[PDB]
């Protein structure tokens, strides 16, 4: 029977005990504002599409810049540490590994290469999950009464170092082994679910199926947010760039200037998407250009269209650059004050 | 004549004012730890040859971890600020952009793409250098007396944010702009610096030679370290990474366990490179692995070997993980507390 590792059952009590002992290394690095590692990763090899390297350093620097803004610390993963739990289901076991070797850190945010921020300025709401220890974009009647295989999304989540944790690591992983397992369960799952196509389980559709079957013991600690893009579905995202530019500001996080553009169907690097990947990687472009506006008009730049990589000025040069003060505070935001 | 930006002449006194007015963001972290900004970067554009997008990735990677463990943020640039100081000229202006920007920086550490932290426990001596405003590897001998073009390093130094390293950058960027100032100007590096080929002005000789030219004005300030590896050519540290795990630890950051493996030479984004491709790529490869393996190791997992992108388990799993202080202190090291 395949184990993510040792049971332990006492994981709170030794966070506990280990904090006391280390208060250099506080859980909260200040009222409601808790630590947090933003986790990705890609494969350890280069991409079979060869462009598809490119972007994923696009990715990266995407998300640098919005941690380094916000004060999350940031792993990037490119090693397979189980072979059973390759592909999608590789995110379990080093989930597993970072919130025990880390027991520092609050919540972790796990977020896809392919999701990129596009909005620097939108700050999660903390304090809204006080009470919570799994935080996903989606939908209560997508999940638990259409048990649809994308009422929920598990591209960009936050889970809390806590037993509970453990424990839902625990009851995700089974249909992930690799084989006759995975297999078999993407057959349960294609039955069960809602609009899902016919394939080996994935680590999305077996959160929708747990969270749906076992909502009595899951469903109390998980929070499904709508209210902000969490996750956003590129396809409905990336054609209103301009009109989010004309008509509104960073900061919303909703469909006014949305946190996260996911390019979900999009394979870039690998083969088989859903969408041809010209159109695909274009999009990418805007979207990084779109979150990289805001990075380079702090100082000074703006790229010349979202689909441009040269950059202009936005304002001359000054002898005095202490006497303005970015527009939307994110030089020097509270965040890392 | 070209202008890196209108004059400033009191630089300190505005840093001084700005501080004392946002205690919030000191510009030391520690009582002997300065506020570090670490600044890379790479051109917008895919690589021609695409293979040097994934060297780029796993680059940025290594850095990411090294900073983290460290308590240094990066930038991570991709835009050409000024058409003339293309290139490798192009750090210019960016250094002066982000000092500017950044009153609360004390130290900027320019780290070339193809620089690899290859010591990820060595911490730089930083009290070694607090009245020194730029820190390079290179040797007083080399510069000063042979004017060698090679007597220092440029691709990974430290500058202080300062009134004197905005009149160095003044000082440093006249043989920049491209075009025909950029080729007279190596005409005379070529007829004036030992060992030079006969090739266009580049940064790194066009410091040797106003350091050699204008010792009295700025040698004061400058720190040409050689007791370790701020830069390390990796032509002849690469082949004795095996002798180095054999004989040593992390932690000497020099000949014994070099803190940067630097790739001079090798140019896999493009087409050239003074040197083979192959060797590059697989040495490259080499030099990430050590590095990562000192990350893993952290993680109970290390490389199957040091060309090999497989890792495997150093120790079983346990479910008391919390009684294991790494064997290097890099989880909960001090530089993060
Ligand atoms: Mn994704
Ligand atoms: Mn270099």
Redesign the pocket.
């Known amino acids: 029977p395949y184990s993510l590792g040792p049971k332990i059952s006492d994981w709170d009590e030794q966070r506990r005990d280990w904090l006391k002992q280390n208060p250099s290394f506080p859980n909260f690095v200040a009222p409601n504002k808790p630590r947090v590692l933003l986790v990705t990763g890609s494969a350890p090899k280069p991409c079979e599409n060869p462009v598809g390297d490119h972007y994923l350093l696009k990715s990266i620097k995407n998300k640098i810049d919005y941690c380094r803004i916000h004060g999350i610390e940031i792993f990037y993963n490119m090693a397979l540490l189980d072979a059973e739990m390759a592909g999608f289901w590789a995110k379990l076991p080093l989930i597993r590994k970072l919130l025990l070797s880390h027991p520092e850190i609050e919540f972790l945010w796990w977020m896809?290469?392919?999701?990129m921020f596009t909005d620097m300025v939108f700050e999660l709401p903390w304090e809204r999950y006080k009470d919570y220890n799994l935080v996903m974009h989606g939908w209560n009647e997508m999940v638990y009464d259409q048990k649809n295989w994308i009422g929920l999304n598990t591209?960009s989540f936050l889970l809390r170092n806590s037993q509970w944790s453990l424990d839902l690591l625990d009851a995700w992983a089974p249909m992930g082994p690799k084989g006759k397992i995975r297999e078999e369960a993407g057959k349960v799952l294609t039955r069960e679910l809602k609009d899902r196509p016919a394939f080996e389980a994935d680590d999305q559709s077996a959160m929708v199926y747990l969270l749906a079957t076992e909502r009595e013991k899951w469903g109390g600690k998980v929070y499904l947010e709508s209210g902000y893009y969490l996750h956003g579905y590129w396809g409905i995202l990336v054609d209103r760039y301009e009109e989010m530019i004309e008509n509104h500001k960073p900061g919303f996080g909703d469909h006014r200037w949305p946190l996260v553009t996911?390019?979900?169907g999009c394979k870039p690097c690998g083969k088989f998407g859903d969408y041809p990947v010209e159109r695909c990687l274009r999009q990418m472009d805007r979207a990084f250009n779109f979150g990289d506006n805001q990075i380079l008009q702090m100082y000074g730049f703006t790229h010349k269209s979202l689909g441009s990589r040269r950059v202009k000025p936005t304002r001359n040069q000054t002898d005095r650059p202490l006497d303005a003060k970015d527009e939307f505070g994110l030089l020097h935001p509270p965040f890392k004050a």
Chains 1, 2 share one sequence.
Request: proline share 0%.
């Open positions: 896809d290469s392919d999701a591209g996911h390019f979900v």
